[PDB]
């Protein structure tokens, strides 16, 4: 069960996350599980639901242990509730190991599961500090590291159309090209990082760098969009509207509320600007940038009914809880969650986005002498 078995172990549907096959219980029950760097619970559907193909049946698992403790999680988009226990867990196309881990058996939920997403649970890969009900509930990756000899690192290569790879324990050098650039993990809760500069077609947004990270910035495979604090979002939208002015779109497009469509194969990519996010480097006032093409931030919406055309949602939206570098930002980068060294590395992925004019990039180094601290 080494890296060379772990490649192409992820699948997905656009806008609905990326999932990996896992088993829970004894005999193993196979479940598809969303890979979520934005949370820290292993939480699996454990009762029937209109949107679940299958669910964890605790009664059929000999090795299940009830912890006699409930968990209730209301969050922005929805809610879920369940019962805590432990059981044996493996990742068939992941490391060749079986561990005993905490499992939240989801017994009731509202707008948590998605119709036709093909996943039945979430694997929260962030740290204990944001586990529910509290930080005493050891996250899965912590249990994995403790119980096996797996190195304390994983990587995600997410690809647009979807699929990709989660490599646990090391770095698969066949999954990226060029250099890996690291940004520090600021605090171990979410995967919190610091953005030092934003450019839109090379034009600096010219804001105090604290605004980019009000009130935190995170790398979150469980969020589709690039989410930006209000001030930054409004400035970004003004610049992208300015760059793309040869065409005018309804306000609903800018709000993520409606599609823009063009005749099949005629999307005018080159009227849309590239977005550069400069991330704090590992040494003082050094940074690197990751560049995001419109092929990333205009997310295609597959629909047989609209298929004479190519249609997209604007996958950048306003946030009141900080910046979220979601799946559209991670797509086409090889992203290394180097927990052992408290850092996230970015490199150009095997499935990077490009046309004949422009390519997604990871480039550095950059220096800024006149710098304050960019964190809140
Ligand atoms: C432990 O409680 C939660 C609450 C919310 C989540 C969440 C989540 C919950 C359900 C579905 C999705 C999701 C939906 N669409 C696409 N990707 C992920 C995402 C919200 C934010 C994030 N990173 N994960 C995960 C665990």
UniProtKB/Swiss-Prot annotation:
Q: Which UniProt keywords apply?
A: Acetylation, Aspartyl protease, Cell membrane, Cell projection, Cytoplasmic vesicle, Disulfide bond, Endoplasmic reticulum, Endosome, Glycoprotein, Golgi apparatus, Hydrolase, Isopeptide bond, Lipoprotein, Lysosome, Membrane, Palmitate, Phosphoprotein, Protease, Signal, Transmembrane, Transmembrane helix, Ubl conjugation, Zymogen
Task: Provide GO CC annotations from the record.
Answer: axon; cell surface; dendrite; early endosome; endoplasmic reticulum lumen; endosome; endosome membrane; Golgi apparatus
As stated in the Swiss-Prot or TrEMBL entry, residues carrying the post-translational modification N6-acetyllysine are 69, 206, 210, 216, 230-231, 238
Superkingdom of source:
Eukaryota
The entry's localization annotation reads: Cell membrane; Golgi apparatus, trans-Golgi network; Endoplasmic reticulum; Endosome
Its record classes its membrane topology as: Single-pass type I membrane protein
Parts of the chain on the Extracellular side = 1-376
What Gene Ontology terms for biological process does this UniProt record contain?
amyloid fibril formation; amyloid precursor protein catabolic process; amyloid-beta formation; amyloid-beta metabolic process; cellular response to amyloid-beta; cellular response to copper ion; cellular response to manganese ion; detection of mechanical stimulus involved in sensory perception of pain
Processing and modification events after translation: N-Glycosylated. Addition of a bisecting N-acetylglucosamine by MGAT3 blocks lysosomal targeting, further degradation and is required for maintaining stability under stress conditions.
Name a GO molecular-function annotation: endopeptidase activity
* Annotated phenotype, changing residue 215 to N: Almost abolishes beta-cleaved soluble APP production
- Cysteine-cysteine disulfides: 159-351, 209-374, 261-311
Q: What is known of its domains?
A: DXXLL motif is required for a proper endocytosis and retrograde transport to the trans-Golgi network, as well as for regulation of lysosomal degradation.
UniProt lists the family membership as follows:
Belongs to the peptidase A1 family.
The entry's protein name is Beta-secretase 1
Organism the protein comes from: Homo sapiens (Human)
Q: What is the lineage of its organism?
A: Eukaryota, Metazoa, Chordata, Craniata, Vertebrata
Segment of the intact protein contained:
58 to 445 of 501
């Amino acid at each position: 069960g080494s890296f060379v078995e772990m490649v192409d172990n992820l699948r997905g549907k656009s806008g609905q996350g990326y999932y990996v096959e896992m088993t829970v219980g004894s005999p193993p029950q196979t479940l598809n599980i969303l890979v979520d760097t934005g949370s820290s619970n292993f939480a699996v559907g454990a009762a029937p639901h209109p949107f679940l193909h299958r669910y964890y049946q605790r009664q059929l698992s000999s090795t299940y242990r009830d912890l006699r403790k409930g968990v209730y999680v209301p969050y922005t988009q929805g809610k879920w509730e369940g019962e805590l226990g432990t059981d044996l867990v493996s990742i068939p196309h992941g490391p060749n190991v079986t561990v005993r881990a905490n499992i939240a058996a989801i017994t009731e939920s509202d707008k948590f599961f998605i119709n036709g997403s093909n996943w039945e649970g979430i694997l929260g890969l962030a740290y204990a500090e944001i586990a529910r009900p509290d930080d005493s509930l050891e996250p899965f990756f912590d249990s994995l590291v403790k119980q096996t000899h797996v190195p304390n690192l994983f990587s995600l290569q997410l690809c647009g159309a979807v699929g990709g790879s989660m490599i646990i324990g090391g770095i698969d050098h066949s999954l990226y090209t060029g250099s890996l650039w690291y940004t520090p993990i600021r605090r171990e809760w979410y995967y919190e990082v610091i953005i030092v500069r934003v450019e839109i077609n090379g034009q600096d947004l010219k804001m105090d760098c604290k605004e980019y990270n009000y009130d935190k910035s995170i790398v979150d495979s469980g969020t589709t969009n690039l989410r930006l604090p209000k001030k930054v979002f409004e400035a970004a939208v003004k610049s992208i509207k300015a760059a793309s002015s040869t065409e005018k779109f309804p306000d609903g497009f800018w709000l993520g509320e409606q599609l823009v469509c063009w005749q099949a194969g005629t999307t005018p990519w080159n009227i849309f600007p590239v977005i550069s996010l400069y991330l704090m480097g590992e040494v003082t006032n050094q940074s690197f940038r990751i560049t995001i093409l419109p092929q990333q931030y205009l997310r295609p919406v597959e629909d047989v009914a609209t298929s004479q055309d190519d249609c997209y949602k604007f996958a950048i939206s306003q946030s009141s809880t900080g910046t979220v570098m979601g799946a559209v930002i991670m797509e086409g980068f090889y992203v290394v969650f180097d927990r052992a060294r408290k850092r996230i590395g970015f490199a150009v992925s095997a499935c990077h986005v490009h046309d004949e004019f422009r390519t997604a990039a990871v480039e550095g180094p950059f220096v800024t002498l006149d710098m304050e601290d960019c964190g809140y």
